[PDB]
Amino acid sequence: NWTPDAIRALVDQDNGKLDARIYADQDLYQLELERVFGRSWLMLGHETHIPKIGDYLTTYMGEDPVIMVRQKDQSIKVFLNQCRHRGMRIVRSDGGNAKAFTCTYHGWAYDIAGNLVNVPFEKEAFCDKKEGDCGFDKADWGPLQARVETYKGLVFANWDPEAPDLKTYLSDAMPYMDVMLDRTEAGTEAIGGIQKWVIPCNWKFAAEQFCSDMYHAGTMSHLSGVLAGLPPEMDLTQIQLSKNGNQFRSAWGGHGAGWFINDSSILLSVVGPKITQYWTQGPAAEKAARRVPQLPILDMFGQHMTVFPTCSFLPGINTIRTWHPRGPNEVEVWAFVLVDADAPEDIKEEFRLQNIRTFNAGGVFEQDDGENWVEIQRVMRGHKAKSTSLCAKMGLNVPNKNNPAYPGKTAYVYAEEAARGMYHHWSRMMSEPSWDTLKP
Amino acid sequence: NWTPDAIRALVDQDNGKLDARIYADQDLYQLELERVFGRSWLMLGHETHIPKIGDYLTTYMGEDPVIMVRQKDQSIKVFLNQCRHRGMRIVRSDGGNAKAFTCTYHGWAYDIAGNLVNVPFEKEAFCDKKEGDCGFDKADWGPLQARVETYKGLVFANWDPEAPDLKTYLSDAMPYMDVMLDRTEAGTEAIGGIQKWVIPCNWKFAAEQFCSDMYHAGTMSHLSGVLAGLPPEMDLTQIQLSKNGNQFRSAWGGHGAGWFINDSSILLSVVGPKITQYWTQGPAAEKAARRVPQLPILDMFGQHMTVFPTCSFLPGINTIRTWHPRGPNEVEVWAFVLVDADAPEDIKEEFRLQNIRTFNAGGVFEQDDGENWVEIQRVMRGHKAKSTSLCAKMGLNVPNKNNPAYPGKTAYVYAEEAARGMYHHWSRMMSEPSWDTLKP
Amino acid sequence: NWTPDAIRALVDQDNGKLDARIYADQDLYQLELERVFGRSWLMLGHETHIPKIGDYLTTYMGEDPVIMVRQKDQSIKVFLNQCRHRGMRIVRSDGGNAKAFTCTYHGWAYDIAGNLVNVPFEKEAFCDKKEGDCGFDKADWGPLQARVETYKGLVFANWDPEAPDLKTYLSDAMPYMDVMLDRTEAGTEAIGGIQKWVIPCNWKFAAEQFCSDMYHAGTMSHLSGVLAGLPPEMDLTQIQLSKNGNQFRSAWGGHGAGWFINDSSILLSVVGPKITQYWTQGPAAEKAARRVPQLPILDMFGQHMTVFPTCSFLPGINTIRTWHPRGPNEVEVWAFVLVDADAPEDIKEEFRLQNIRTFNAGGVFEQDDGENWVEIQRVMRGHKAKSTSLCAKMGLNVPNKNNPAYPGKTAYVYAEEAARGMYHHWSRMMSEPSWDTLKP
Amino acid sequence: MISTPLSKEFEWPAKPVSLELQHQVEQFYYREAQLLDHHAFQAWFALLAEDIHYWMPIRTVRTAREQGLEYVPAGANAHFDDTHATMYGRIRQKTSDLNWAEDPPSRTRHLVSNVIVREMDTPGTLEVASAFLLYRSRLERQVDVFAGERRDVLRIADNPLGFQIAKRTIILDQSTVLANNLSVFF
Amino acid sequence: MISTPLSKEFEWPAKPVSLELQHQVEQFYYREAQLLDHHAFQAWFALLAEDIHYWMPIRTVRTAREQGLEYVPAGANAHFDDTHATMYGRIRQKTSDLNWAEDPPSRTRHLVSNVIVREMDTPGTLEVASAFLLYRSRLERQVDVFAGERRDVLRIADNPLGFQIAKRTIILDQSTVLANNLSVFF
Amino acid sequence: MISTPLSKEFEWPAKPVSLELQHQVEQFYYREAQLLDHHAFQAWFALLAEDIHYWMPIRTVRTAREQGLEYVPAGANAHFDDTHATMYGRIRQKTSDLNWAEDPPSRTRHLVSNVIVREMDTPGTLEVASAFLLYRSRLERQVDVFAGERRDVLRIADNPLGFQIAKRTIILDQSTVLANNLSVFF
Ligand code: FES
Ligand code: FES
Ligand code: FES
Ligand SMILES: [Fe+2]
Ligand SMILES: [Fe+2]
Ligand SMILES: [Fe+2]
């Protein structure tokens, strides 16, 4: 199969080259389920998805279905959505409120903590004189639990007891996240309705685009999307090129962000003038700048980001989504919209409507993004095409593109530095068996 | 791949644990096609499906299409439904009467015995002066034949010349089968119409349920099915719990049955009062009890059974079916209804109508059964979920649950003893290359 | 996996036997993509598909999408339809005229030669002071090119620099091709409209049928097709058997052809009396016979042929097609119709209409051909069925069936000599790593 | 003709029925489908006459000379073969909240077209053939498509829909059932 | 308009035709589909006029500036391009019991909707557009779905259906044919 | 009733509307589908009233006791939630030749059936429910099938089609969107 050496060779960040096999190979995909999704922090939803005791959300870690559920002590637990008797899905709804989770096959019932608490016929069929006296103990048969940590509203989970805690894993990337998540003491909240759709491409195309690829938006991909936002009197001949900005590569972990500087037009085309004003001027913007002092946030526009492997979002448009993998050739997008909890309701309503318009299965920006990933994937079915050496050189050894205004490693807004770190980090996770070496 | 040791570890009947990989792993599935379906006795249909000379039925052994056909001497033969020239399906219908089976590609024709008897252009193209004088002999190119044996009406087949005969393979299970198959000197007959449908689950979920799982019917799975049978004036609050019965584990081979004792309500809900009376009282029931003296058959209600690997039925409801495997993640159910050939026609008509109502693709019991298997299968796509250790402990080392009224090994009606023997037998077949050790 | 010895054993041309695994095994299929499609000459289309500078056709080599495009110097180039940045399909249309091929993801633009000529933001993002001074050179990132050669109108391509040239590879088969391709100094032309459809069978069934299998048409497969062409007053009782003809096995490479001699009825049923007269009598036929002097072309009727691996056609009906493989269990047919460029237009119109009638997705001959391949494929899902030893003995060691009127090795029209050489050649390609031994 | 073979085309009347009758029958069918597609099972069941016979025979695959064996006959095994009493039980199951194959419920669409009406010899009674496309999707990704023909006997009725279904025979254009169940009504 | 591009919408008349005519045309189409879906091939063929032209062009994939190349034109290769004589031969093949692609026969459903009628300048002649969904299933598990548009010229006729088909052009909403054949009529 | 829950059946009028009105509404819908299926996007957009609200809510999977949570409500996330201005922008994108998800363009068929009409309390205004099957295929092999229900408010209008769409709500019979986008109009 694949030696660590064989896997590391698929990615060359020094020479800027990627082996196309990373996006199609089935054997590599199964190793990703073990070595990447099995021990990464994965985004499941937002605390506001499960405000009250017994509230739950069913979602995924990789291809494993899990239940995320608010506990009596206000903690959140996450466990596999699988009965330990014969494997039935315990919870069949997308979310709701429970006092108990019951398996409909043989009626095994679980409390909201995931403990097994009721086995029909235990007394008659599973023991002799008292519970547990013939080797059957309900304590033994609870579904696998994940580690759970939140970061300013976002709920992340990780199966691996040996992995670093959440903040450690986030490396030097937290201020970039804060641009969206920490603008106000009030925190954020999720607009109801997670939109879910299926794209026949590899997760890494989508993870990489939000990590490192403003290039596609500053060139061809979103011309018609921008056009959709213009008044009848204007055409694409009256839209100026965007050339000034930077991108960030996290010190550890494969995270990435990019943005334009001191040009609000990228943002204006997607979110409109009302949100642009809110984002930049007045008391809410002032408070944000005090709350995220590590960054010149009022000069940053149209930011993209990925928290590796699959949590991606666009601060200021405020779409956020997880890419659930479905083999090497398919992904599900699970997206929702975040708003500052104390924003005026006209602002919340504009975030809601502009999001549906743009970054949505039906949206005028997203539809063109996915069409690209799907066509790439189709071509990689070819035998020559699947082994192509792809160019990740953009920005490589190109000097004087960093920006000392920003923490950590930076490069030009049109660059693949973030992308190179993403694939470099993937190759580490894929080739190093233990956190002994992998941890920051 | 998989060592015998690696395979035996997937099943622990001493500690009562199953590795979930048995239901999803593709490599294990291909070994099942070789080591289980390739040398097990598989149920193909009933003698009454092919009453007359030249009558045939096309069906399956695993994923191999076969022809079962009545011979001139009243014997039955079974051979692969595949032309030996280039592989075309020889017979394209579900069944009928033939004098010959002709391949439509190049017109090679086969007698009802499966011998090749007519090769178009043999004289001009395949030999010089007389047939066979250049190395082509029709005798050499007949499709593979299976061993064929019937057991009281049921036709079983086996490819493996080294396997035990049918009755030997049936171990100590025949009386349990006789409860359905040997109630009368007249034998049984199949109502016309084999119903066929596709369920996206592993065959073993269905084989196990009919082997060993009354638990699901005494708990949650069939509440609505029972409710469907109640008069408007009754609800589920007027249905008593069922707690008394036993199950049987065959001495060899993975076979299993279970039933309730001296409580006809399980049966009544499915088959109605007319069949319940016929099954228990009057001349037909009396004669059955004389014909199956090894069992207290008039005290047994709602019996389930599997003859390993994939022949399952419900004596007294009289549904019978084979689970044809279609990879690890899919099965076809091929089911039909058996009735005593000498039953009054009102009884035959009630069996027919109650069967469609209950254990049928549209039936009020079956639809809920399959929904369970399908959801399990979906969850096992997960990486953690596919390697779960599942509980097969029920009844394990729980004393004093046997019943000396019944032959062989018995346990409580709510138990997994039969199920444990099923998986133990699967693991033997999967890990022992020769009948030298595998035979009883 | 598969040793050369293991692969050679799948085909026995001395004893006339084929292992059925060749048509279903996935591992063998991937080796076919490397060892057969990766280094064979594959038919892409006709020069008349791309008459003018900048005209292009998108099609396939195996499962790799390629662009075939007319160059400024009237040469033709073929290169992979895949952007070297992240893999997007460069060209999204079936064909047209271009001055440039632009990737819609990041706007990388390619000239019609396949060179990368425009990288958006190269100056700002990819270099320091001048193009190429930081390691990024557009010359490095063009899509893979194929070798390209034409043979009398047909465009073939090959990835492998070490393979023999086209004519060398065609061995002693060119006169047989010329029967269709070289009847006139005017050459042939393609009627517009490539018909494309998907058949769930292995490519080798279709490649073999056109290589070597007149048998299926002289027996059962096309009775109804012939019947469709008869006047109301006639039935199949008035159609004489066809028994006289020959077939050809190329000296090297797996090519094959067959035909009837001095009996135009096979041709008449498919192409009609007007084409039959044109093919046999008058100035056009006379000139053809002068142009193909190596063969008695006016005595040849209903010829079939395959140029290995996947270029097949029927001289005189003039259907031509490539079988694009889509895994072991599927193929796409890409077919078109060729006519002599100087034929009278009534003749061209009859070729057009008779072709749609007969050898077309809707055609009365083709529909029955495919039904055979599809049913074979379905049966090979079986475990016993997939390992069957199939009979390729027809004609083997049957003496005095050659015809000295024809060049190279010949045998009876009903024979599998051509077919045996096809599979023998497949087994060589599959087991011999280097042209050092494989070349003629 | 009520006993025309299901393999044979519908025996439509020499000339089509009036526009008014065509409209009433179509409108009835569209309301029936609304009830099903919105899981109004009690309201739907009210449309079944007390003497309803609801049947869906099994279809088999046969070569030319045994084509009259295509349909498994009346009086043998079948996919549905129901009375007002058994259909009532099915409806109890469907409205119980314990029908696990329908909990959560399927999303269905019954498209109704090709409606051909025949007036029978009893006033107020019609024989109607129609084509259907039944789209069913459930849970995350499951989709089943069923297509076929319905042949009904309708009776004019004093209910707010103006008809009851006295007989329903469903031709399904499948042999092997490709869905994992038939947990929806046709 | 008979030579409107297939890429262009149907040129419906300023106001819709009468209810009576709409009903007659729809009812004709539903009877035609019954004949096909019950394999009444001789009876169906009787509906084709002696001057029938039955055509289904090939559809190709094109980017914006070469969109007028979508349809392979008349006079070039095509999926069907038939006369009364060639259609007769197809019907002989279909009723022979030797058509292996149809032996055993496919199970089809032709759903007919979106019927738009235009009266032409000759009395008794109509141009009609409609949408179709053709469901085909065969053998154990094979299913093919075809969708598209038909544009016909119908002529009033003294037969028991009251029309014959004088022209049929079929738009299929596929480029690559996704089925293994086109062994059914549209 | 305009605010009937989407989980509930359509509130049809006690008796069906006139034949003439049914025909006008159906004929309108068939012309609308022609425009869409032939990519006449400007002409289609002309059918949207200036006060149009075009919405397609998200559908979720729920067990029995949380079934009233099926539909994500108005005022929350959705698949479409559009005005005349945003729909205009979508149309600019669709006619630009730069919409890569539609370049090359999809092949669609909108089959329209089960049309139920209700006259509202303002003359000239109708509430209409219908069923749809939207077939979409593109590039070589991609096929997406969408089925569902549309509930419209139509207004009589002086345009050559005689109506404008004042409101459109689309029920899609999916929870997870199974297509890679919703790049077509319903
Ligand atoms: S599978 Fe959950 S209780 Fe049995
Ligand atoms: S494949 Fe059966 S005779 Fe050739
Ligand atoms: S993938 Fe082609 S320019 Fe980026
Ligand atoms: Fe984008
Ligand atoms: Fe059950
Ligand atoms: Fe042929």
CSV table of C-alpha atoms in Angstrom, one decimal, chain A residues 156-423:
chain,number,residue,atom,x,y,z
A,156,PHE,CA,-15.6,21.0,17.5
A,157,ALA,CA,-15.1,17.3,18.2
A,158,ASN,CA,-12.2,14.9,18.1
A,159,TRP,CA,-12.1,11.1,18.7
A,160,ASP,CA,-8.4,10.9,19.6
A,161,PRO,CA,-7.5,11.1,23.3
A,162,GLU,CA,-3.9,11.8,22.3
A,163,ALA,CA,-4.6,14.8,20.0
A,164,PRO,CA,-3.7,18.4,21.2
A,165,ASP,CA,-6.5,20.4,22.7
A,166,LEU,CA,-8.5,22.7,20.4
A,167,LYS,CA,-6.7,26.0,21.0
A,168,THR,CA,-3.3,24.3,20.7
A,169,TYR,CA,-4.4,22.8,17.4
A,170,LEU,CA,-5.6,26.2,16.2
A,171,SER,CA,-2.0,27.4,16.3
A,172,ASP,CA,-1.7,31.1,15.5
A,173,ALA,CA,-5.0,31.2,13.6
A,174,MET,CA,-7.4,32.3,16.3
A,175,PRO,CA,-7.3,36.1,15.6
A,176,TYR,CA,-8.3,35.4,12.0
A,177,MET,CA,-11.3,33.4,13.2
A,178,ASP,CA,-12.1,36.1,15.7
A,179,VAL,CA,-12.8,38.6,12.8
A,180,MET,CA,-16.1,36.7,12.5
A,181,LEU,CA,-16.5,35.0,15.9
A,182,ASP,CA,-15.5,37.6,18.4
A,183,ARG,CA,-16.7,41.0,17.2
A,184,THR,CA,-19.0,41.5,20.3
A,185,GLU,CA,-19.3,40.4,23.9
A,186,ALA,CA,-22.8,39.2,22.8
A,187,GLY,CA,-21.2,36.4,20.6
A,188,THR,CA,-22.8,35.1,17.5
A,189,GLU,CA,-25.9,33.0,16.7
A,190,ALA,CA,-26.9,30.8,13.9
A,191,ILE,CA,-29.8,31.7,11.7
A,192,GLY,CA,-32.1,28.6,11.7
A,193,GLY,CA,-31.8,26.2,8.7
A,194,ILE,CA,-28.6,24.2,7.9
A,195,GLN,CA,-28.5,23.9,4.1
A,196,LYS,CA,-27.2,20.5,3.0
A,197,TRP,CA,-26.2,19.5,-0.6
A,198,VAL,CA,-24.0,16.9,-2.4
A,199,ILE,CA,-21.1,17.8,-4.6
A,200,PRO,CA,-19.3,15.1,-6.6
A,201,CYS,CA,-15.8,16.3,-5.8
A,202,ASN,CA,-13.0,15.7,-3.3
A,203,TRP,CA,-13.2,17.6,0.0
A,204,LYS,CA,-9.7,18.9,-0.4
A,205,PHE,CA,-10.7,21.1,-3.4
A,206,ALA,CA,-13.2,22.9,-1.2
A,207,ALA,CA,-11.0,23.0,1.9
A,208,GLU,CA,-8.1,24.4,-0.2
A,209,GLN,CA,-10.2,27.1,-1.9
A,210,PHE,CA,-11.4,28.6,1.4
A,211,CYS,CA,-7.8,28.2,2.8
A,212,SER,CA,-5.9,29.9,0.1
A,213,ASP,CA,-7.7,30.7,-3.1
A,214,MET,CA,-8.7,34.2,-3.6
A,215,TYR,CA,-7.1,33.9,-7.1
A,216,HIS,CA,-10.2,32.2,-8.6
A,217,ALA,CA,-12.4,35.1,-7.4
A,218,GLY,CA,-10.0,37.8,-8.7
A,219,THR,CA,-10.0,36.2,-12.2
A,220,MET,CA,-12.7,34.2,-13.9
A,221,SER,CA,-14.8,32.2,-11.6
A,222,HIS,CA,-17.2,34.8,-10.3
A,223,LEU,CA,-17.6,37.3,-13.1
A,224,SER,CA,-21.3,36.4,-13.5
A,225,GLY,CA,-21.8,36.4,-9.7
A,226,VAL,CA,-20.6,39.9,-9.5
A,227,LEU,CA,-22.6,40.9,-12.5
A,228,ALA,CA,-25.7,39.6,-10.8
A,229,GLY,CA,-25.3,42.2,-8.1
A,230,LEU,CA,-25.0,45.2,-10.4
A,231,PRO,CA,-27.7,47.7,-11.2
A,232,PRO,CA,-29.1,47.6,-14.8
A,233,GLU,CA,-27.0,50.7,-15.6
A,234,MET,CA,-23.8,49.0,-14.9
A,235,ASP,CA,-21.8,46.2,-16.5
A,236,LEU,CA,-18.5,44.4,-15.8
A,237,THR,CA,-16.6,47.2,-17.6
A,238,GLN,CA,-17.2,49.4,-14.6
A,239,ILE,CA,-15.7,47.1,-12.0
A,240,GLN,CA,-12.1,47.7,-11.0
A,241,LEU,CA,-9.5,45.0,-10.7
A,242,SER,CA,-8.6,43.9,-7.2
A,243,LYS,CA,-4.9,43.5,-6.6
A,244,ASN,CA,-4.1,44.5,-3.0
A,245,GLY,CA,-4.2,42.1,-0.1
A,246,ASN,CA,-2.6,39.3,1.8
A,247,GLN,CA,-2.9,35.7,3.0
A,248,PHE,CA,-1.9,33.8,6.1
A,249,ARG,CA,-0.5,30.4,6.6
A,250,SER,CA,-0.8,29.0,10.2
A,251,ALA,CA,2.4,28.1,12.0
A,252,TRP,CA,1.1,24.6,12.5
A,253,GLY,CA,-1.9,22.6,11.3
A,254,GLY,CA,-2.9,23.5,7.7
A,255,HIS,CA,-5.1,26.6,8.5
A,256,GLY,CA,-5.3,29.5,6.1
A,257,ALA,CA,-6.9,32.8,5.4
A,258,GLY,CA,-6.9,35.6,2.8
A,259,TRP,CA,-8.4,39.0,2.2
A,260,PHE,CA,-8.3,42.3,0.3
A,261,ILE,CA,-7.0,45.4,1.9
A,262,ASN,CA,-8.7,48.8,2.0
A,263,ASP,CA,-11.0,48.0,-0.9
A,264,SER,CA,-14.5,47.2,0.1
A,265,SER,CA,-15.8,46.3,-3.4
A,266,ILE,CA,-15.3,42.5,-3.1
A,267,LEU,CA,-17.4,42.7,0.0
A,268,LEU,CA,-20.0,45.1,-1.5
A,269,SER,CA,-20.7,42.8,-4.4
A,270,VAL,CA,-21.6,40.0,-2.0
A,271,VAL,CA,-23.1,41.6,1.0
A,272,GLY,CA,-24.5,44.9,-0.1
A,273,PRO,CA,-24.0,48.4,1.2
A,274,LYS,CA,-25.9,48.0,4.4
A,275,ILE,CA,-23.7,45.2,5.7
A,276,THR,CA,-20.6,46.9,4.3
A,277,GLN,CA,-21.4,50.0,6.5
A,278,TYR,CA,-22.1,47.9,9.5
A,279,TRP,CA,-18.9,46.0,9.0
A,280,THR,CA,-16.8,49.1,8.8
A,281,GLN,CA,-18.3,52.1,10.5
A,282,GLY,CA,-20.2,53.0,13.7
A,283,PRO,CA,-20.3,51.4,17.2
A,284,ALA,CA,-20.3,47.8,16.1
A,285,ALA,CA,-17.3,48.1,14.0
A,286,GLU,CA,-15.5,50.1,16.6
A,287,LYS,CA,-16.1,47.5,19.2
A,288,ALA,CA,-14.9,44.8,16.9
A,289,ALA,CA,-11.6,46.6,16.3
A,290,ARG,CA,-11.1,46.8,20.1
A,291,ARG,CA,-11.9,43.1,20.5
A,292,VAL,CA,-9.6,41.9,17.8
A,293,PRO,CA,-6.5,44.1,18.3
A,294,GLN,CA,-4.0,41.7,16.7
A,295,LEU,CA,-5.3,42.5,13.2
A,296,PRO,CA,-6.3,45.7,11.3
A,297,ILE,CA,-9.8,44.3,10.9
A,298,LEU,CA,-11.4,47.4,9.6
A,299,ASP,CA,-9.0,47.4,6.6
A,300,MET,CA,-9.8,43.7,5.7
A,301,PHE,CA,-12.3,42.8,3.1
A,302,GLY,CA,-13.8,39.6,1.7
A,303,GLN,CA,-11.8,37.3,3.9
A,304,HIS,CA,-11.8,33.5,3.4
A,305,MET,CA,-10.7,30.9,5.8
A,306,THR,CA,-10.3,27.2,6.5
A,307,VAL,CA,-9.6,25.7,9.8
A,308,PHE,CA,-8.1,22.3,8.7
A,309,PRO,CA,-9.4,19.9,7.6
A,310,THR,CA,-12.9,20.9,6.8
A,311,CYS,CA,-14.2,24.0,8.6
A,312,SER,CA,-14.5,26.9,6.2
A,313,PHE,CA,-16.1,30.3,6.3
A,314,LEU,CA,-16.2,33.9,4.9
A,315,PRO,CA,-16.0,36.6,7.6
A,316,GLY,CA,-18.2,39.5,6.7
A,317,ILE,CA,-20.5,37.5,4.4
A,318,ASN,CA,-20.7,35.1,7.4
A,319,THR,CA,-21.4,31.8,5.6
A,320,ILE,CA,-19.8,28.9,7.5
A,321,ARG,CA,-19.8,25.2,6.5
A,322,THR,CA,-18.3,21.8,7.1
A,323,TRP,CA,-17.3,19.7,4.2
A,324,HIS,CA,-18.3,16.1,5.1
A,325,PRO,CA,-16.3,13.6,3.0
A,326,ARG,CA,-18.2,10.9,1.1
A,327,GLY,CA,-15.3,8.9,-0.5
A,328,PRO,CA,-12.6,10.5,-2.7
A,329,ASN,CA,-15.1,11.6,-5.3
A,330,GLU,CA,-17.9,13.2,-3.2
A,331,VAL,CA,-18.6,15.7,-0.4
A,332,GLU,CA,-21.7,17.1,1.4
A,333,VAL,CA,-21.8,20.7,2.2
A,334,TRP,CA,-23.5,21.5,5.5
A,335,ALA,CA,-23.7,25.3,5.7
A,336,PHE,CA,-25.4,27.9,7.9
A,337,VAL,CA,-25.3,31.6,8.5
A,338,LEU,CA,-23.9,33.3,11.6
A,339,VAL,CA,-24.8,36.8,12.7
A,340,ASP,CA,-23.7,38.9,15.7
A,341,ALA,CA,-26.3,38.2,18.4
A,342,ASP,CA,-26.8,41.9,19.1
A,343,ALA,CA,-26.9,43.2,15.6
A,344,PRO,CA,-30.0,45.3,14.6
A,345,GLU,CA,-32.7,43.0,13.1
A,346,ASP,CA,-32.5,44.9,9.8
A,347,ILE,CA,-28.8,43.8,9.8
A,348,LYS,CA,-29.6,40.2,10.7
A,349,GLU,CA,-32.3,40.2,7.8
A,350,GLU,CA,-29.8,41.5,5.3
A,351,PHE,CA,-27.2,38.9,6.3
A,352,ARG,CA,-29.9,36.2,5.9
A,353,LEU,CA,-31.1,37.4,2.4
A,354,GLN,CA,-27.7,38.2,1.0
A,355,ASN,CA,-26.4,34.7,2.1
A,356,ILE,CA,-29.2,32.9,0.3
A,357,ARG,CA,-28.5,35.0,-2.8
A,358,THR,CA,-24.8,34.2,-2.9
A,359,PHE,CA,-23.2,31.3,-0.9
A,360,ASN,CA,-26.0,28.7,-1.1
A,361,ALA,CA,-26.8,25.7,-3.2
A,362,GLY,CA,-28.9,28.1,-5.4
A,363,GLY,CA,-26.5,31.0,-4.8
A,364,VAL,CA,-25.0,33.1,-7.6
A,365,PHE,CA,-21.5,32.7,-6.3
A,366,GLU,CA,-21.5,29.1,-5.0
A,367,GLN,CA,-23.0,27.4,-8.2
A,368,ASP,CA,-20.0,28.5,-10.2
A,369,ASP,CA,-17.5,27.4,-7.5
A,370,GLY,CA,-18.8,23.8,-7.3
A,371,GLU,CA,-19.0,23.4,-11.1
A,372,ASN,CA,-15.2,23.8,-11.1
A,373,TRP,CA,-14.6,21.1,-8.5
A,374,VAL,CA,-17.0,18.6,-10.2
A,375,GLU,CA,-15.3,19.0,-13.6
A,376,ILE,CA,-11.8,18.5,-12.1
A,377,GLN,CA,-13.0,15.3,-10.4
A,378,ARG,CA,-14.5,13.9,-13.6
A,379,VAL,CA,-11.2,14.4,-15.5
A,380,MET,CA,-9.2,12.6,-12.7
A,381,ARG,CA,-11.0,9.3,-13.7
A,382,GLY,CA,-8.4,9.2,-16.5
A,383,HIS,CA,-5.3,7.1,-16.0
A,384,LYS,CA,-2.9,9.8,-17.2
A,385,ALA,CA,-5.0,12.5,-15.6
A,386,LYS,CA,-5.0,11.0,-12.2
A,387,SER,CA,-1.2,11.0,-11.9
A,388,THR,CA,-0.6,14.5,-13.1
A,389,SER,CA,1.9,16.7,-11.3
A,390,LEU,CA,0.0,19.9,-10.5
A,391,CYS,CA,1.4,23.4,-10.0
A,392,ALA,CA,1.4,24.7,-6.4
A,393,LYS,CA,4.2,27.1,-7.1
A,394,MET,CA,2.4,30.4,-7.0
A,395,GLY,CA,4.3,32.7,-4.7
A,396,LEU,CA,6.9,30.1,-3.9
A,397,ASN,CA,10.2,31.9,-3.2
A,398,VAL,CA,8.7,35.1,-4.4
A,399,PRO,CA,10.1,37.7,-2.0
A,400,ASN,CA,8.7,40.6,-0.1
A,401,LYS,CA,5.0,39.6,-0.2
A,402,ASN,CA,4.5,39.4,3.6
A,403,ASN,CA,2.7,42.0,5.7
A,404,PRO,CA,4.1,42.8,9.2
A,405,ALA,CA,0.6,44.2,10.2
A,406,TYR,CA,-0.6,40.6,10.6
A,407,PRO,CA,0.5,37.8,12.9
A,408,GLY,CA,2.3,34.7,11.7
A,409,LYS,CA,3.4,33.8,8.1
A,410,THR,CA,1.9,36.0,5.4
A,411,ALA,CA,2.1,36.2,1.6
A,412,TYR,CA,0.2,37.9,-1.3
A,413,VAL,CA,-3.6,37.6,-1.6
A,414,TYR,CA,-2.9,35.8,-4.8
A,415,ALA,CA,-0.7,33.0,-3.5
A,416,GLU,CA,-0.5,29.3,-2.6
A,417,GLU,CA,1.4,29.6,0.6
A,418,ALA,CA,-1.6,28.8,2.7
A,419,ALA,CA,-2.4,26.0,0.2
A,420,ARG,CA,1.1,24.6,0.4
A,421,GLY,CA,0.9,24.5,4.2
A,422,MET,CA,-2.5,22.8,4.0
A,423,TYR,CA,-1.1,19.9,1.8
